Enzyme design. Structure first.
Site, PDB file in Angstrom:
ATOM      1  N   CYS A 177       0.832  -1.216   0.000  1.00 29.32           N
ATOM      2  CA  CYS A 177       0.000   0.000   0.000  1.00 29.32           C
ATOM      3  C   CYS A 177       0.870   1.271   0.000  1.00 29.32           C
ATOM      4  O   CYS A 177       1.920   1.310   0.649  1.00 29.32           O
ATOM      5  CB  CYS A 177      -0.973  -0.017   1.190  1.00 29.32           C
ATOM      6  SG  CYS A 177      -2.041   1.464   1.144  1.00 29.32           S
ATOM      7  N   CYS A 227       1.802   2.557   3.389  1.00 27.55           N
ATOM      8  CA  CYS A 227       2.941   1.829   3.926  1.00 27.55           C
ATOM      9  C   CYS A 227       4.264   2.244   3.299  1.00 27.55           C
ATOM     10  O   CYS A 227       5.255   2.316   4.017  1.00 27.55           O
ATOM     11  CB  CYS A 227       2.688   0.337   3.762  1.00 27.55           C
ATOM     12  SG  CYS A 227       1.792  -0.200   5.243  1.00 27.55           S
TER      13      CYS A 227
END
Length: 108
Positions: free
Chosen positions: A31, A34
């Site tokens: 993601c 992240c």
């Protein structure tokens, strides 16, 4: 950090049996949240290697952030005795993440 996220995480009641200063991080290795928060943790954690870190893969793995009642998806909950002492939601800058790490490691 040399290792990626894990789907194989404990349930919230099995986690409650652990004991020690343990950060539990919700996200994935892939993601865009992240990709910003992972190098954030990597910068702060280099001064606090005695803290534990658990990378919980919230896509394919256990939905652990539900049972922490997480606000924004990139969140990490600081435990001690296997129970919450704090959490950081949306770090943004190492000045926010480091400020929490020293406060929960006991160097505050």
């Amino acid at each position: 950090m040399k290792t990626r996220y894990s789907a194989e995480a404990p349930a919230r009641d099995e986690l409650d049996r652990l004991a020690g200063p343990t950060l539990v991080e919700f996200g994935t290795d892939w993601c865009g949240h992240c990709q910003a928060a992972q190098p954030l943790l990597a910068e702060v954690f280099s001064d606090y290697p005695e803290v534990g870190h658990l990378k919980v893969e919230d896509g394919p793995g256990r939905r652990l952030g539900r049972s922490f009642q997480v606000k924004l998806w990139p969140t990490f909950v600081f435990l001690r005795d296997g129970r919450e002492v704090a959490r950081v939601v949306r770090p943004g800058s190492a000045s926010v993440l480091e400020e929490a790490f020293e406060s929960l490691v006991g160097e505050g």
